[PDB]
Amino acid sequence: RFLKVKNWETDVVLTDTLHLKSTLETGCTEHICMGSIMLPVRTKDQLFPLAKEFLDQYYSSIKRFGSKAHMDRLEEVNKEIESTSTYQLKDTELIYGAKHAWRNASRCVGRIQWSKLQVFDARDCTTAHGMFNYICNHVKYATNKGNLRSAITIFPQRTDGKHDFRVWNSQLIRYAGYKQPDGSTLGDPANVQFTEICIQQGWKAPRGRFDVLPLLLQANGNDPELFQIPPELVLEVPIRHPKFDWFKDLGLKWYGLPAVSNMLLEIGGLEFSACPFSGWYMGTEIGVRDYCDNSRYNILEEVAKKMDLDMRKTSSLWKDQALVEINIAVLYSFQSDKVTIVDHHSATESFIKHMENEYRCRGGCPADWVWIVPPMSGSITPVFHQEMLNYRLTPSFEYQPDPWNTHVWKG
Amino acid sequence: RFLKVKNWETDVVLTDTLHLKSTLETGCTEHICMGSIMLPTKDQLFPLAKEFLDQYYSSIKRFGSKAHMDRLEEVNKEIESTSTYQLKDTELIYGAKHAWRNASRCVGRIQWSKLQVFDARDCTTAHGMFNYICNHVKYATNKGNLRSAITIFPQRTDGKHDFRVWNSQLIRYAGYKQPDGSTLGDPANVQFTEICIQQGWKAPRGRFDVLPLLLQANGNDPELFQIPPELVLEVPIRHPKFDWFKDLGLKWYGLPAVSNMLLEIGGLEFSACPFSGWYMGTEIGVRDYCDNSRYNILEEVAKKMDLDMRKTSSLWKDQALVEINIAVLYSFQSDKVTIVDHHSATESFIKHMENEYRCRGGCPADWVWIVPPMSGSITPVFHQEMLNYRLTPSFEYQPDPWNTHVW
Numbered sequence: 001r002f003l004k005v006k007n008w009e010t011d012v013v014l015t016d017t018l019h020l021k022s023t024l025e026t027g028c029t030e031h032i033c034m035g036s037i038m039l040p041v042r043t044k045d046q047l048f049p050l051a052k053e054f055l056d057q058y059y060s061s062i063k064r065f066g067s068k069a070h071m072d073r074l075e076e077v078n079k080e081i082e083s084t085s086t087y088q089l090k091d092t093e094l095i096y097g098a099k100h101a102w103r104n105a106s107r108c109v110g111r112i113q114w115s116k117l118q119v120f121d122a123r124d125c126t127t128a129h130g131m132f133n134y135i136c137n138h139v140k141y142a143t144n145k146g147n148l149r150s151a152i153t154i155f156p157q158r159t160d161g162k163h164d165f166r167v168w169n170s171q172l173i174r175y176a177g178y179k180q181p182d183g184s185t186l187g188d189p190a191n192v193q194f195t196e197i198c199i200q201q202g203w204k205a206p207r208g209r210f211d212v213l214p215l216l217l218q219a220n221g222n223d224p225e226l227f228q229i230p231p232e233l234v235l236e237v238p239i240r241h242p243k244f245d246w247f248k249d250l251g252l253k254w255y256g257l258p259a260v261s262n263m264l265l266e267i268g269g270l271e272f273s274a275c276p277f278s279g280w281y282m283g284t285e286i287g288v289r290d291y292c293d294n295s296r297y298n299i300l301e302e303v304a305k306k307m308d309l310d311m312r313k314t315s316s317l318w319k320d321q322a323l324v325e326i327n328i329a330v331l332y333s334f335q336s337d338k339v340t341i342v343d344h345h346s347a348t349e350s351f352i353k354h355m356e357n358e359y360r361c362r363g364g365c366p367a368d369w370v371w372i373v374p375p376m377s378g379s380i381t382p383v384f385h386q387e388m389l390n391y392r393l394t395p396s397f398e399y400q401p402d403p404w405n406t407h408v409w410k411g
Numbered sequence: 412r413f414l415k416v417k418n419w420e421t422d423v424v425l426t427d428t429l430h431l432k433s434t435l436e437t438g439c440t441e442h443i444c445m446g447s448i449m450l451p452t453k454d455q456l457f458p459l460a461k462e463f464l465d466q467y468y469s470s471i472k473r474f475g476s477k478a479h480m481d482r483l484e485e486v487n488k489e490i491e492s493t494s495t496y497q498l499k500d501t502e503l504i505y506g507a508k509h510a511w512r513n514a515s516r517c518v519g520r521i522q523w524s525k526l527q528v529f530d531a532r533d534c535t536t537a538h539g540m541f542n543y544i545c546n547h548v549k550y551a552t553n554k555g556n557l558r559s560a561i562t563i564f565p566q567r568t569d570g571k572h573d574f575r576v577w578n579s580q581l582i583r584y585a586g587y588k589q590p591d592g593s594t595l596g597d598p599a600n601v602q603f604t605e606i607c608i609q610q611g612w613k614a615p616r617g618r619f620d621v622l623p624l625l626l627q628a629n630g631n632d633p634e635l636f637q638i639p640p641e642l643v644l645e646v647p648i649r650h651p652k653f654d655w656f657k658d659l660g661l662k663w664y665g666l667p668a669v670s671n672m673l674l675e676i677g678g679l680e681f682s683a684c685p686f687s688g689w690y691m692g693t694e695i696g697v698r699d700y701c702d703n704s705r706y707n708i709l710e711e712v713a714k715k716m717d718l719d720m721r722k723t724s725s726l727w728k729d730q731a732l733v734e735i736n737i738a739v740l741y742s743f744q745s746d747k748v749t750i751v752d753h754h755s756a757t758e759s760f761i762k763h764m765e766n767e768y769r770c771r772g773g774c775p776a777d778w779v780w781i782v783p784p785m786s787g788s789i790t791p792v793f794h795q796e797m798l799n800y801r802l803t804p805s806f807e808y809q810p811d812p813w814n815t816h817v818w
């Protein structure tokens with residue numbers, strides 16, 4: 001079968017065949033679309049076809065499909081599964097797997113970069129201290145003094161589900177949040193629950209507006225341990241505005257390295273429950289969501305006052321006006337300090353080119369419009385006008401439950 | 412089978428059961444989501460009538476009444492005999508209000524029950540259609556105090572006797588292709604602006620010429636009429652701080668009036684059913700003015716503001732976008748013409764959703780369309796999970812008539 005998508009601004013029509021190789025479900029049916037819903041141990045039985053499919057993919061990409069090397073590898077994996085009930089990926093396979101998980105990530109606007117991913121193999125790790133060391137090296141490599149480099153670190157795969165490696169932080173670098181007795185929040189409201197856990201686990205909180213959280217690291221299904229990331233490894237950027245001099249006195253800053261650490265990486269039926277990955281920020285992630293969401297730092301008002309906008313009627317668009325000036329500030333600050341960042345115009349334009357290229361060389365590009373379209377100025381970006389097909393390919397990144405809800409405590 | 416939707420800003424969780432009453436298809440499958448795609452007999456007719464009459468009579472608390480069963484048999488006998496049937500006025504009004512209620516892409520549905528329905532099923536000619544349409548325009552415009560309305564022309568019979576309004580909206584600006592290869596007026600209407608000329612319309616070849624109506628009654632050839640200029644309320648666009656803005660020469664019309672959709676009620680098809688409400692500011696300032704395949708004035712405005720247009724990262728496009736939208740709102744408000752900003756309209760839709768959840772069991776909604784085209788995440792609808800599904804009565808798309816009509 002063939003499926004067409006149309007860009008309603010250019011009238012370019014692309015044809016998708018790649019969706020035929022789709023395995024996983026979407027959540028939608030002929031009778032309902034679940035497109036805007038945020039969040040919609042394997043047996044010997046299920047494992048071999050999942051492995052075979054992946055190795056077929058891998059060997060195709062290297063133009064060795066049907067070769068003796070291909071056949072021998074399938075036989076070896078087969079034997080290993082029936083003897084040990086799991087299997088180990090070769091280095092080459094792991095790298096290919098991790099790059100393709102990113103490539104297949106339909107909510108990611110940054111995928112033009114997918115083939116440039118530094119893969120750190122941490123499968124020999126056994127303790128939380130060893131995890132800390134690997135993560136420290138990842139942060140140093142990825143930061144690169146401001147000249148950011150995409151990377152992923154991969155800890156040992158799941159076995160019986162009782163010896164999982166997990167990074168309990170949602171991101172390697174994130175600011176604490178503290179609920180006050182008066183109901184107000186100091187710091188990042190999104191991180192209150194995790195901050196509470198850290199404190200209970202022994203963290204001494206300085207209790208400021210921008211305290212970098214410690215790492216909470218779980219190895220081999222053991223109880224998690226607290227580690228502090230060396231401050232000299234945490235690159236931060238003070239936020240100022242090119243024309244507004246009072247903006248610096250708002251006291252804002254942010255970290256340079258966006259590094260997601262709570263997702264599950266699935267490759268050929270194997271599950272890697274700890275696989276922190278990092279790239280660089282699109283400006284609106286910070287300026288629109290982190291700073292201006294009502295449920296986060298929420299500075300729209302304070303900024304709006306300082307600009308002396310008419311804040312009486314929403315139709316003055318004072319919220320919209322402040323939002324833009326803030327996003328100008330975030331971009332200006334990072335560029336001035338020479339920390340890698342991309343604006344939403346540049347990012348979305350690059351994504352359209354990537355997607356066209358993918359339709360031509362691969363037969364499609366799974367994409368989630370609800371997430372691809374930026375959270376400000378939607379229709380003046382080329383993605384808004386682009387029809388997109390959403391479906392799931394493997395290898396892939398998946399959500400998993402928060403560890404504090406599932407963990408069996410040793411004490 | 413019972414579905415929950417979460418608002419990620421307020422943690423309010425709603426439970427949806429209404430989707431179980433859905434009959435039509437979404438385009439999605441378990442293997443692929445098509446959420447961002449813009450486009451999708453006697454024996455067939457009676458269950459549709461029944462389904463419709465059942466919900467009608469349920470709404471008036473007379474489900475399982477003699478009056479219910481009576482109408483059901485009467486309609487059945489009418490179909491068995493005439494191969495169609497006619498709606499009572501009460502049912503017609505119910506169906507139209509519910510078609511709006513069920514429109515999953517419409518952010519303005521909180522007003523759904525306050526719709527003025529004009530029954531034009533006695534109309535037989537294009538001059539008659541014109542008259543009904545002028546009356547609709549004048550009633551809805553109301554000197555700037557806008558009122559929602561729909562006018563319903565005769566239903567489809569054998570597909571040969573179709574009533575159609577050829578225009579996409581009752582009021583729209585012409586579009587012409589100029590020697591340069593550029594475009595004067597509205598690029599969206601070039602093809603239609605030419606079908607008007609190619610039918611006899613003398614164009615002022617200006618930038619903002621109100622298009623003529625092209626009206627098709629009972630299948631016959633379409634005819635041209637100019638809407639009395641005194642019936643077309645327009646707003647000069649000025650900025651409340653930039654005195655140079657008024658010299659850009661922009662204006663827009665007050666009345667958004669969609670005329671190319673198909674209204675389906677109880678299996679019956681109303682191919683000509685123009686409806687109108689009032690604008691959300693972004694439709695004009697973001698889409699009409701700043702879209703690249705429309706009036707596309709961002710560059711000109713940015714210049715006038717003397718912004719650094721060297722690098723995308725100065726966000727000069729964004730800055731100007733906001734100002735253009737401030738001006739649209741300011742101009743309509745100053746000239747006393749009904750308009751709503753995107754903040755107000757989305758706040759209203761949230762309240763409406765919550766009302767619909769507790770009184771109906773849900774509210775079909777298309778997030779891709781409900782979220783405004785600027786400042787999306789600072790509006791409450793961005794953080795709102797929504798379920799999209801198709802209920803009837805409904806408004807549907809239908810083919811452009813100039814590809815189907817046999818002269």
Ligand code: HEM
Pocket residue numbers: 102105107108109110111113117150151152277278279280281282285342347371397
């Ligand atoms: C290098 C520059 C990158 C940029 C500019 C970028 C941008 C984004 C943005 C804006 C989102 C939306 C998430 C949100 O708004 O909260 C996203 C999602 C995502 N990104 Fe990228 N990203 C980059 C690199 C990467 C890398 C290196 C990986 C993995 C190796 C990755 C994997 C993903 C995945 C799996 C999602 C979906 C998350 C979900 O489903 O919730 N990205 N990306």
Ligand code: HEM
Pocket residue numbers: 511514516517518519520522526559560561686687688689690691694751756780806
């Ligand atoms: C009264 C104020 C109203 C407001 C503020 C409003 C707002 C909107 C907006 C912004 C859209 C998105 C369409 C686009 O961006 O092009 C929309 C879609 C729609 N509206 Fe409303 N509307 C109003 C009245 C009405 C009325 C009176 C009806 C019918 C009786 C209606 C039926 C629809 C339908 C069927 C769609 C979706 C059409 C499609 O699928 O393309 N609206 N509305």
Ligand SMILES: CNCCN(C)c1cccc(CCc2cc(C)cc(N)n2)n1
Pocket residue numbers: 110258259260263277278279280281282285
């Ligand atoms: C529910 N989604 C938010 C947290 N998750 C799972 C997530 C996953 C991938 C990307 C993001 C946004 C943060 C981010 C990460 C990376 C690696 C790059 C970037 N520009 N931004 N977040």
Ligand SMILES: CNCCN(C)c1cccc(CCc2cc(C)cc(N)n2)n1
Pocket residue numbers: 519667668669672686687688689690691694
């Ligand atoms: C791609 N579809 C856009 C044109 N169509 C069919 C359409 C249908 C309903 C509404 C609109 C937007 C114009 C409009 C109409 C009405 C009645 C109110 C309003 N604020 N805006 N457009």
Ligand SMILES: C[C@H](O)[C@H](O)[C@H]1CNc2nc(N)[nH]c(=O)c2N1
Pocket residue numbers: 008384385386387388446447448449779780781
């Ligand atoms: C490709 C995508 O479906 C298309 O650009 C849609 C996106 N969302 C929209 N939303 C509204 N309200 N109106 C539109 O015309 C569109 N266009």
Ligand SMILES: C[C@H](O)[C@H](O)[C@H]1CNc2nc(N)[nH]c(=O)c2N1
Pocket residue numbers: 035036037038370371372419793794795796797
């Ligand atoms: C309910 C809705 O799906 C949810 O708010 C989504 C909308 N789109 C998004 N898009 C991005 N990039 N990031 C997000 O967190 C969200 N949130």
Ligand SMILES: [Zn+2]
Pocket residue numbers: 028032033034035439443444445446
């Ligand atoms: Zn869907």
